[PDB]
Amino acid sequence: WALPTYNNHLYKQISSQSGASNDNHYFGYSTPWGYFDFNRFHCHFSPRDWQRLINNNWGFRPKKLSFKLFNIQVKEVTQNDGTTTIANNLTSTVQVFTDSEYQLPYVLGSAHQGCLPPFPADVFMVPQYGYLTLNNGSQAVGRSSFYCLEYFPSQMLRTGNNFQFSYTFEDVPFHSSYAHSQSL
Amino acid sequence: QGPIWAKIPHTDGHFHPSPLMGGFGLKHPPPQIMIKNTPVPANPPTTFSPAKFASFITQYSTGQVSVEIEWELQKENSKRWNPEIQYTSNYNKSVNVDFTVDTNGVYSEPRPIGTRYLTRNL
Amino acid sequence: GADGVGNSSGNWHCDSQWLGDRVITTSTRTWALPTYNNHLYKQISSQSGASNDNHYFGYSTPWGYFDFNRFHCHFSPRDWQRLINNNWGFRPKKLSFKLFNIQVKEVTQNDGTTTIANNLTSTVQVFTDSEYQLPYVLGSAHQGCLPPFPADVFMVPQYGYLTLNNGSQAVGRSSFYCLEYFPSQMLRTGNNFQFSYTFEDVPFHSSYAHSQSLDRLMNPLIDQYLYYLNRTQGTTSGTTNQSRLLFSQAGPQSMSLQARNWLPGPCYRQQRLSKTANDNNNSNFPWTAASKYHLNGRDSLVNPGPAMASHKDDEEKFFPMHGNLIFGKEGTTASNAELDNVMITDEEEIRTTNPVATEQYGTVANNLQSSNTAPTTRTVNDQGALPGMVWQDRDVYLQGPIWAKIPHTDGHFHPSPLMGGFGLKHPPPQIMIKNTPVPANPPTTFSPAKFASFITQYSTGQVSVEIEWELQKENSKRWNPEIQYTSNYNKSVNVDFTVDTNGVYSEPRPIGTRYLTRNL
Amino acid sequence: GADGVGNSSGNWHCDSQWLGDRVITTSTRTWALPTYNNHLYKQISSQSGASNDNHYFGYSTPWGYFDFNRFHCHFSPRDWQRLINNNWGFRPKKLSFKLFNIQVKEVTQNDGTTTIANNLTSTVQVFTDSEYQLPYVLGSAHQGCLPPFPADVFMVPQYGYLTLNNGSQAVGRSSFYCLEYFPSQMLRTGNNFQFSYTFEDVPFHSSYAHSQSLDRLMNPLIDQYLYYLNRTQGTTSGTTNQSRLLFSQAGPQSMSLQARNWLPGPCYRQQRLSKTANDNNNSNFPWTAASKYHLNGRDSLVNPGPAMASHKDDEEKFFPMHGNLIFGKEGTTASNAELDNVMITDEEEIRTTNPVATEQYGTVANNLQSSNTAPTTRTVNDQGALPGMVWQDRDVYLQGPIWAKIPHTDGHFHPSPLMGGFGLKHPPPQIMIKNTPVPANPPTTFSPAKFASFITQYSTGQVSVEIEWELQKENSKRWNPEIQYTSNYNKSVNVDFTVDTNGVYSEPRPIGTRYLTRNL
Amino acid sequence: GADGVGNSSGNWHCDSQWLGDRVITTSTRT
C-alpha cells in the first residue's frame, strides 16, 4: 500500500455547490487521514477458492480477524529543478488507530473504492477519509457534528515498528449458498 | 467482488437488518483503521511567528498490510439423487484465461459470481 | 446368524456419508434366483464349424453369482459428482457383504394357471471363492451387476467358465470344476450370510488432468545451455557453399528442438473412424483393418489397447476403431444398433502424456546417410516400452468396471486393467449362490437311474454391499477456477439420471473422472 | 535470524573435504537481482502464425529463482578428478541453503548520469515450493545457474512457465499461478534465509565401465552342452545331397552362435553424422531426417534418446544426429555456431550393454520359409522393452545436469532423466526471490487506477549451498593399472580450467565419469 | 423388538387422561 498526504495536513469543510443540485445537497468535512478497507470478497478469496466454497456449502459466515501493518517506509520527495528525487526519511513516523468504540461515522459498507486489489501482485493507493453530517440544503444545522481524528489516541510508528489488531465477529446467520428445489 | 458486511445503524428500530446490497449486517462490525503521515515542518524563521504553520516537507508512506479472516462453513447434506449445477470454466479453446492477467499485465474478472449453486428443499 | 420365519434377518442399508478423508457407500438391492441348467452341469463348446477365432470349450453350472464390479452399484450420480469435483484421486479399502431376508418360492403349472407358494423348509447354498480356486469370471464387463437405481430388482447371473481348447475340442490339461465340491453355507428363511474383505495396496486413481504438457515443460523465458545441430548444408548460400555443420543453442523459440528428459507413453496404432458415415471408406473393415493380436493361431481383437488419446486438437469427431470403451443407452438391441443409440467415451485429458491412438507415434531413422545416400525416415506405428517413458492410465466412468484380477503368471508389466480401474492380485472373491435341489415324488420301487424329477422353484432376498473408499484430497495453488461437472440449468425435458413417464431409470451420458488439474 | 545494518548476516563458506565414505561440498557466490516484468504478471504465447510445432501458452512472473542443478556448481575440477578416478559410484544426500548479506539498491536517472544509492528500509521476498504446487522449471538445462568459477558474479534468472495449449490459444483446463499467493519470508538488510533438504533413495550413478561385454561373457576354454542348428542344406555336397538338418555343439569357436542369457538395452535409431563436412549428404536434414515423436499433433525432437553408444570401434568421427549432449565453448553465438565452437560428448564406455545409436538393432524374421518360400530378414530399427534386457544409463559431466523431477503421472518406466543424472519424485524445491515493489510519489487526490509509478531498484547478496554426497568405494582385483583422467604434462599455452589474460574462466573439455572398470 | 408369527407385536392403546397441567392422548387405528 501507498499513502500520500491528503488535504495538505488540513481539515477542510466541504459542502454542495452554490445551487448546483437539490436532492444532492450535503454538508461534511475532509480529513488528512487515510483508511484501510477490505469489505470485498475478492480481497480474501481467490477465484479457485470461491469456487470450492460456492460448490460445496449450504452456507458460510465470518468468525475472527487479524490485522497487521508492517515493513513501513517513509519517503520524502523534492522538486529541485525539473527532476524529482525521492529519499528516505528514517526518523519520520506514521499514525494508526482503530475506531473500536464506533465514535467515528462508519464510512465503510457503502461500496466505495480503495479496497484491497483482487490480485495480490497489485499495489493500491489508500483511500482518504471523509464523512457527512446533518444538513439543511448546502447549509448545516446546530446539531451537526465535527470529528477530529487527532483527538484519538493513536500509535505512532517509525520504520521497523508495526501494528497489530484482532477482532471477533458477532453471531450472524449463515449466508444462503443454496437455491430452493421447491416453490412456495 | 461484492460487499461482505455493513454496520447496522444505531436506531430505535430495525426490521430485517440484512444489508440491502447483500451480506452480513453487524451491530459492531470490523472497526475502521485510520492511517496518516505525521506532519513534518520545513525550515522555520529565526524570528517567532504566531501564524499558523503551513510550510511542510512533502512526503508519502508505503508498507505492507495483512488481513486474516476465519470463516465458518455450513456443510452440504442433500439426498438429491441427480447431479446439481456447479460453477465451471469453459473447457473450450479460448482466447484469454478467465480471471487472469493479459498481454500487458492487467488482472480482470470476466463475470460476477453468485453463490447459489447447490439446492436445498423448503 | 440364526432367527425365525416371522423375523427379518436384516435391514435396508442404502446410504453414503463423507468423512473428508474417506467415504463409505452402502448399497442394498432385491435379487431373484431361478434354477439354472435344471440343476445340471453341462459341457459347452463351439458350434460344429460355425467360427474359428471364436472356438471355445468349457462348462455350465447350476450356480448363480453376485457381481458389483460397476461404480454405479455404489455411487449415486450426485455422489460421483462430489468425488469427481474435489479429489486428486481415490481407492477401495474395505468391504462388507450380506445376504438376508431370503424367501424360497416353488411354482406349479396345474392347468393353465401358475400358482406360486412358500416352501419354508427349502434351503439355498452360498459360499465365497476366497482361495481363488475357481476361474475368476468377473472383471470382464459382463451383465447382471447391481442395478444403478436402488428401486430396480435384478436377476442373478448364471456361472460359466472357459478352459483350454484346441478348436471345438479340448486338451488333456483342461480343468473341470464342481462347485458342490466346495464347503458352502446352507440357508433357510431367517438365516443369513455374512462376509468381510480388505482390499490390497493399490495406487489411487487419476481423478486429475495435467495442466502442463510433456513437451511444454521448460522455462519460456530462458534459453538452454545445450546445443543441437540444425543446419547440415544450408549456409550463406551464394558462392562455394555446398554444406557445413552448424549448431544452435536451444531457445524458447526452438521449443520443439530442445533437449528433452522424458518420453510419451507406449502406443499401438488404431484405425481412425469418423462419426459422419460418409467421411469413411465405402468398405466393411471392422475386422480386416482393425488392430488385433493372436495367441495359438487365434486372432483376438485388441479392443481397449494401451492408454492413448482419442483425437487431436480441433477435431473431436474422430474416434479410434474401438480404441475406447462404449456404453449402450437404455433399451438398445444387442445386435447392430445405431450410432445414436450408444455412448462413446472421449479420452482427451491424457493428450499431454500419451500418443494419439489413430495418429503415428514418431519418426525413426533407418539408414547410413552420406553424400552417396539420402537420409531415410520411417514412420513408427508401434512402440514397445522405453526407459524414460511416462504415461497416464484409462479413466473410470460412473458405470465402468472397478477392479480386475491380475492373472497369476510369471510376468506382468503395468498390471492396471486395460478397461480401466484397479488391478488386484487378490480381488473381492466370487460369491456363489444356488437353490438346493428338491426331488419330487419318488417311486415305491427302487430305481438306480439318475434322479431327474424335481420340484420347480426359485429364490429371492436382499443383498447388501458396503465399501470404504480412501480419498486423495485436492491441493492446488491454481488461481483461476477449474472445470467442474455440472447439469444443464436450462429449461429441459427430462431430468438427467432419472426415471421417466413409465418408470425407467436412464443414465444420459458417461461420466469421466478427470476434472481437477494437477501439474506434471 | 535477525541482526542489524552494520552486521553481516553470514560468512563465505566455499570449501570441500572428503571423509572416504562421503564428501561435503560447500559453494558460495554473489548474486544480483533486477526487477523483472516491471512487477507485472504478463500472459505470453506464440507469435501469430510464426511456427506450429513451437506453439505455446504460459505466463511471465516478476519473480526470480535460484538454480544449482549443474555439477560444476559444487565440484571444482580437481575435486571432480578425485571423485571420478576413485569411486564405483556416488549420489546426493543432504542440502543446506542460505541467503545473506543482502543489499537493496535503488537507482535514479536524473540527467545523463545514473546515481545508485542504498535503500535500507526496502525488503525482498523469498520462499520455497516445498509442496511442489508450482510448475517445476528446473532440470531443463536452462541458464542462470551458479558460476563454475567462485569469483564470478551471476544474474538471477526470471521465472516463467508453460501451461496447456491448443496452438497459440489456451484451453479451459489451463492453470494460472500467482506467486504472491504463497507465504514468503520478507528480508531487510541484516535479515537472512535458511533452508535444509534431504534427498530420497536414488541409485548410485555409474562411475565405471564394464571390463566385459554382453556377448563375451562365457568361458573361452570350454564348450557348452547345448546344441544349435547351423546347417540347413549344406552337406556332403556331391551326389543326391540337396538338404539336411545338422546340429553343432557350441564352442569357443562358434562364439557368436552360442545360447545366450541376456539382451542388450532398448534402442531408437538416430541418424549418423560425420564431423568432416563432406562425408555427409548435400542436404539440410536436421529436422526432416532426424528422430522425433509427436504429442497432440505436435512434432518434438527426440534429442537425447535412450542410452545408446555414439560410435562403433575404429571410428570416433561419427556422432549420432543430436544423439548426445553438446556443450558450448566460452563465448559462442547462440545462433548457428561452428563445429570448432562446441563440445560434443562421446558415449563409448557403454558399448558393452547398449546398441549403437546410428546402427541398426538386430534382425527379425517375418515369413514362413519352406521349399516354396525363401526365408526373409527384416532389419529392426526400433526396439521396445524385453524380458532379459540389461543396460547402462547416460553419463554425467562436470558441467552436466544433476537431478530432474519425475513427472507425477500414472506410469513411468526407468525414471532416470534422459539428459542424465538423478530422477527424483521430490527434488530440491524451487527457491523464489523478488524485490518488493516500492511505489513512487502518489497523488494528493485519490486515484483508483492501477498503481504503475514505482521506484526502480535491484538487489544483491550472497548465496550458499551445501551438499553431502555418498560415495561408493572402488573394490577391484584388476591387476593392471586402469585409465585415469589427467592433465597434459606437456609444455602448454594456457592451463586447463583457468582464467586467461583478461580474466575469463573457461572449461576446456567435457568430463565424463566412467574411468574405473567393473565386471558384468 | 423381535418376536414370532403367532405372537402379537403390540396392543391397542386408545385412551386419554388429564393431569390438570397436561393431557395425554393415545390413538390406535388399523
Ligand SMILES: Nc1ncnc2c1ncn2[C@H]1C[C@H](O)[C@@H](COP(=O)(O)O)O1
Ligand atoms: N445480517 C444480519 N444480521 C443480523 N440479523 C439478521 C441478519 N440477517 C437476518 N437477520 C435476522 C436474524 C434474527 O432472527 C433477526 C434479528 O432481528 P433484530 O432486529 O436484531 O431483533 O434478524
Ligand SMILES: Nc1ncnc2c1ncn2[C@H]1C[C@H](O)[C@@H](COP(=O)(O)O)O1
Ligand atoms: N491397478 C494396479 N495394481 C497394481 N499395481 C499397479 C496398478 N496400476 C499401476 N501399478 C503399478 C504400481 C507399482 O509401482 C507397479 C508394480 O508392478 P509389479 O508387476 O507388481 O512389480 O505397478
Ligand SMILES: Nc1ncnc2c1ncn2[C@H]1C[C@H](O)[C@@H](COP(=O)(O)O)O1
Ligand atoms: N534416477 C532414478 N530415480 C529413481 N529410480 C531409478 C533411477 N534410475 C533407475 N531407477 C530404477 C531403480 C528402481 O529399481 C526402479 C524403480 O522404478 P519405479 O517406477 O519407481 O517402480 O527404477
